[PDB]
């Protein structure tokens, strides 16, 4: 009689289809998904420090739009800009807006230190009904609108040395009046000039007079510029009119901070990886949720599914 001894392997009733080099569809006993395809729909507020911009863009929080006063001196790992955000101060633009937004976002801080420039011969603290703060005509909190004093605007030539151990970021602007008459009412002379310089950089701007479409009844515009002053360097401001003066400097840092456009709510949870859709788990190596990511994130791919076999070929009876 003797015996029979048979060698074999297991099989399962519920196999999984995977792709190989030679076969588009082959069934194995088990597999695991390598593409994360869902988020939880909220941005977890740990471990990264999240600052919800609410109604404010980062640039409006920087300049000091009155609805953004709560953001003064705040810090973030990720600033979240909402699509509902709107400006509600004096109409402005920023040449190379995207770069100023980027450099502030990457710095991660709106810490601001006031400085005494000692503006002599001019009127400080100009305001506008386009920029209401506490039911009163106001202006960007970090900017100083200088105008004539006694129908004189004597030329300004002001120095501010950087005697610190860190870089200073100065934000300033030029006022473009709507008409030649407005130019006189404000600056008591027809042609303003601005020259802002350091030992290693110079920026000279000329106001451009003319009508722009009225925003909160203002046909004028301010154009925003910035200047970085290194330790041992000097800020030199030289102007005969139309200067929107800085009130101090921002600390500029280097680190891991950034900015993201998202409408996802903030949640009390922990997740390393943030997308505009919400946080996603980061166990898998790939994801198809969003090419925009922040943190320890799977890599974005154009595949909805990639199944890795974790078992042998499934061969049922």
């Amino acid at each position: 009689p003797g015996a029979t001894l048979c060698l074999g392997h297991h099989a399962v009733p519920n196999g999984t289809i995977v792709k190989t080099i030679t076969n588009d569809r082959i069934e194995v006993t088990n597999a695991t998904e390598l593409v994360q395809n869902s988020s939880i729909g909220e941005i977890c507020d740990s471990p990264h420090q999240i600052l919800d911009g609410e109604n404010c863009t980062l640039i409006d929080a920087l300049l000091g739009d009155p609805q953004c006063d709560g953001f003064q001196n705040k810090k973030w790992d990720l600033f979240v800009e909402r699509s509902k955000a709107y400006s509600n101060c004096y109409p402005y633009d920023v040449p190379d807006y995207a770069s100023l937004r980027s450099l502030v976002a990457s710095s991660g801080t709106l810490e601001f230190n006031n400085e005494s420039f000692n503006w002599t011969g001019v009127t400080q603290n100009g305001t506008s009904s386009a920029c209401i703060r506490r039911s009163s005509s106001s202006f960007f909190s970090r900017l100083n609108w200088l105008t004539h004093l006694n129908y004189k605007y004597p030329a300004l030539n002001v120095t501010m040395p950087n005697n610190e151990q860190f870089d200073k970021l100065y934000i300033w602007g030029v006022h473009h009046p709507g008409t030649d008459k407005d130019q006189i009412f404000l600056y008591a002379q027809s042609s303003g000039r601005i020259t802002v310089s350091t030992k290693r950089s110079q920026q000279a701007v000329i106001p451009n007079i003319g009508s722009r479409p009225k925003i909160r009844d203002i046909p004028s515009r301010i154009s925003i510029y910035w200047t970085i002053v290194k330790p041992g360097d000097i800020l030199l401001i030289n102007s005969t009119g139309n200067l929107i003066a800085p009130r101090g400097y921002f600390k500029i840092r280097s680190g891991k901070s950034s900015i993201m456009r998202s409408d996802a709510p903030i949640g009390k949870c922990k997740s390393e990886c943030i997308t505009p859709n919400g946080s996603i788990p980061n166990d898998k190596p790939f994801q198809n949720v969003n090419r925009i990511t922040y943190g320890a994130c799977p890599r974005y791919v154009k595949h909805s599914t990639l199944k890795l076999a974790t078992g042998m070929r499934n061969v049922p009876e």
Partner: protein, 173 residues
């Protein structure tokens, strides 16, 4: 698979084997039974876990990057930002799809390999006392009770104990 055992000379897998990936079924004078082989099962599992250790929980941190969505037409610089991102995504998408296809081909081959290795090891243990029936089964030409089967599964079978009996039965007529 490249060894020809799984989905090959082994006709099918065993849904009734639930405590291992590879194993033995026998029929002898005492009945018929099944036992998982722990070492071959563990060898296959360990290799697949090596792949998973490379792939799961190993993401890279990135922080401030470039913008990837744009609200206004801009031309040259925006064209370049979009092209850089599209280029990157296509290259990673290629890497991901190739990785999974290559790894899956290899996983099917290494699990076929472990089945073949167990078969070959058993075949060599039996020496002249058994013949390969061609379907993963050995016809054993001697009385082989449960302890005898267990000595084969455990690697302690002494072929010399049974050789005279087995040669007589094999080389009959």
């Amino acid at each position: 698979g490249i060894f020809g055992a799984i989905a090959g000379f082994i006709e099918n897998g065993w849904e009734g084997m639930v405590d291992g990936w590879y194993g033995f079924r026998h029929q002898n004078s005492e009945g018929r039974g099944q036992a998982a082989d722990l070492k071959s099962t563990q060898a296959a599992i360990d290799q697949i876990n090596g792949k998973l250790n490379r792939l799961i929980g190993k993401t890279n941190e990135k922080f401030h990057q470039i913008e990837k969505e744009f609200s206004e037409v801009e031309g040259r610089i925006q064209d370049l930002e979009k092209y850089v991102e599209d280029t990157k995504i296509d290259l990673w998408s290629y890497n991901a799809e190739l990785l999974v296809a290559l790894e899956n081909q290899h996983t099917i081959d290494l699990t076929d390999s472990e089945m073949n290795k167990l078969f070959e090891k058993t075949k060599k243990q039996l020496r002249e006392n058994a013949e390969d029936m061609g379907n993963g089964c050995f016809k054993i030409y001697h009385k082989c009770d449960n302890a005898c089967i267990g000595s084969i599964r455990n690697g302690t079978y002494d072929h010399n104990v049974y050789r005279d009996e087995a040669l007589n039965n094999r080389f009959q007529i």
